[PDB]
Amino acid sequence: LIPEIPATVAAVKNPSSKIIYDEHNHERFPPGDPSKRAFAYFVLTGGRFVYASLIRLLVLKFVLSMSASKDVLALAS
């Protein structure tokens, strides 16, 4: 009647199992469903493949740039 209890107070004092999320740019899975935990890990694994390959490329490029050159290789007879 008189109180008009606040929204946060009413939420705290009345826990409910019908929890509602935003679901604007991230749609929920139906409540009973296994979590696709492995699929994300394999996606990240492919990305890590790429990152390791790029790091290897860069290190080798710099180090072998510091290496000998075709000029001295051809000069040595």
């Binding site: 710099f62 072998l64 740039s65 000998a68 000029d71």
Partner: protein, 388 residues
Amino acid sequence: TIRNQRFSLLKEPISSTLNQHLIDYPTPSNLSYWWGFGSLAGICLVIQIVTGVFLAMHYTPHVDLAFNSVEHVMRDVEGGWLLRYMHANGASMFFIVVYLHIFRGLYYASYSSPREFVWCLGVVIFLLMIVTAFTGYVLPWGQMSFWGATVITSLASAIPVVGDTIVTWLWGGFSVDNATLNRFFSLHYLLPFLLVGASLLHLAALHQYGSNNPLGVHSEMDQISFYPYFYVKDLVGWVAFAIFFSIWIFYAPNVLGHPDNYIPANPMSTPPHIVPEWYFLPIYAILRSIPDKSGGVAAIALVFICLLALPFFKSMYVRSSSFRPIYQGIFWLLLADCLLLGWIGCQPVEAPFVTIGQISSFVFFLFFAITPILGRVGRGIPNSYTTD
């Protein structure tokens, strides 16, 4: 919480400063992809430094060997073409992402209080970047490098009292010659480390007051740590930048360049079109547009005066331009004018380009001369639109 025994190696003194200022520094949870450019200019600087060191292991600063040494890196050194194209197109990328950094700051009014020191250190960083890129571009000793150096350093004799004395001291002689090449090489090697120091001071000031946000409002209510929430965002930014940079290295390695630089410098012949790199073009355009070359140098100084004077304007309590329609339109007009002015720089100094550049410079300075008026007038908005 008495630290009697160790909990987390992140909180130990060896990793505590890094912990705080990188992993645990709170940032607003609504930052867009426009802050990744600040995160990405540092990566560009690191790329430039590493490629430059590995290039300097092969470059000879003499006047009879610089061009042939650069071609030696091109041809004989294994992977040398990758190093040189990385260095050149990486200077270009550095300037691109720094321009995006600056223009996001302008759009969201990040220069406003309390980040005046952040903006001013950014302006000093911009000076350092410009000088480094120029003195580095003189290094390959091509026609464009030699004659751009001649023109720009000779246009330092506009100072009334000293002039010729400073020019002679800077040249190490009477013309751009071997002494100037060696001097420019040493300075080009040194300056990037001062640039790293300036970047660190830039970041220290920003971390003192915290980053802005698209709304421009106080944002200490909803904040999250930097890692991992913004680490992955910056990772997406870095990979997109890597794709862009790889396109610009492996398929169009000379499009951003100027073909006349592949001619060995010849002081007895002048190329028909002496112009700087594309990222000095707006400054060059303002300088040429203002006649009476002393006036041009004065205008170039005035540009930096305006940039440094931006953060010290009037009230203008609302800062983000998402809630400022007039300032939003003004910003878009400024960006269009800067792009047009950059286009003008590459054009000859004939008509109508003279008039187009004279109007463009006036608009560019009018932007700075109009914003305090916008703030003063908008200071009294709530009293007029109130619904009482």
